Amino acid sequence: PLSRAEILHQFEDRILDYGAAYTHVSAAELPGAIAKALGNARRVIVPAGIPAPWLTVGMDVLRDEPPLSHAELDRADAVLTGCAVAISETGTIILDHRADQGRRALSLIPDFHICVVREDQIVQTVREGVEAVAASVREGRPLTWLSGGSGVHGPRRLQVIVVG
Amino acid sequence: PLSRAEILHQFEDRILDYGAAYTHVSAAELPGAIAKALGNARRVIVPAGIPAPWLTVGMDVLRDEPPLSHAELDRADAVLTGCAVAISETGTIILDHRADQGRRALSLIPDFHICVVREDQIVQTVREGVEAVAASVREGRPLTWLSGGSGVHGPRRLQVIVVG
């Protein structure tokens, strides 16, 4: 097994090669990091399970209750989500669409995805990643795997924020 | 390991428990099965890589070149896709959005998904399923895992057609 430091560095490398933005911050720095990532385009879709402390005044928060129309999603500047697990070897982020991630449309239609990944959600191998989401699969939850590897198609911009 | 027969029966059970329709047909029967699944609502989105022989006169074929708008996708009656692999234990179908599956929007926005699964694409375990799509992940292809387990949220209707 790789060390945690090597895993973090590997994940970073793979996310950067994907063409995504990447930053690793402390919990205290997180709200600022998200704010910084949004810049002056602050119309951000926020799934119900995103912790309040991540959010900051000046965000134009869109909520998905009632569900945002395709047009509302397309007009949003960004979507902010957590994830289920991330895999360092392939720079993969897996969503299982729990409350901090929202339904599939929220990370498909908007053009800029800000995805917050806790340091402890990053595993080295695909095998471990699948183990982490096995229960979600058994529950019938959908999974979306977004990968750098070893808009029309989805968000053309991705910011990954590792925290902790 | 389960036998192929037990695997097929298991996959069927899990897909049926998901609330999906399920049929197992021969290759010769496939075009008819797809036609039968569409009924009188024949406006079907067909990814470029779907083999011509699956398609039948009377289908109102929509192509995604140029890309269909959200409204065009929402107005379509169905989308027809292949898949990457299916897992019997969890009734999971994994898409990797190759040419016979199309971009993520095509299986998210329309309300009725007809998904053709070759008998040889069905594996027993999640472990095997991941092995089957590992190369896609390494390539950076997105994966969508649709699962029964052991519209707003996506297609409210799913027809699975196992072939061969």
Candidates B4, B20, B5, B3; CA nearest to B93 is B20
| Domain boundary assignment for chain A | 1-164
DSSP β-ladder status, A92-95 and B21-25: unpaired
Question: Residue A137's closest chain B neighbor by CA?
Answer: B149
Find out whether A88 and A11 touch, Cβ atoms under 8 Å.
yes
Q: Does A141 touch chain B (CB under 8 A)?
A: yes
In chain B, which residue ranges form alpha helices assigned H by DSSP? 4-17, 30-38, 70-75, 126-138
DSSP string covering B13-26, please?
Answer: HHHHHTT-EEEEE-
Answer yes or no: are the C-beta atoms of B154 and A142 closer than 8 Å: yes
Q: Does the CB of A68 have a partner CB in chain B at under 8 Å?
A: no
d(CA B39, CA B36): 5
- Quick check: A66 contacting B, CB < 8 Å? no
**In three state form, how does the secondary structure of A34-63 look?**
HHHHHCCCCEEECCCCCCHHHCCECEEEEC
- Any bridge partners for residue A117, and if so which? A162
Which chain B residues touch A109 with a CB distance below 8 Å?
70, 105
Q: Which residues of B141-155 are buried (b: 16+ CB within 10 A; e: fewer)?
A: bbbbbbbbbbeeebb
How many contacts (CB atoms, under 8 Å) link A and B?
Answer: 93
B111 closest CA partner among B45, B59, B58, B46: B45
What CATH superfamily is the domain A1-164?
A: NagB/RpiA/CoA transferase-like (3.40.50.10420)
Q: Do B143 and A144 touch (CB under 8 A)?
A: yes
For strands A43-45 and A78-81, give the pairing. parallel
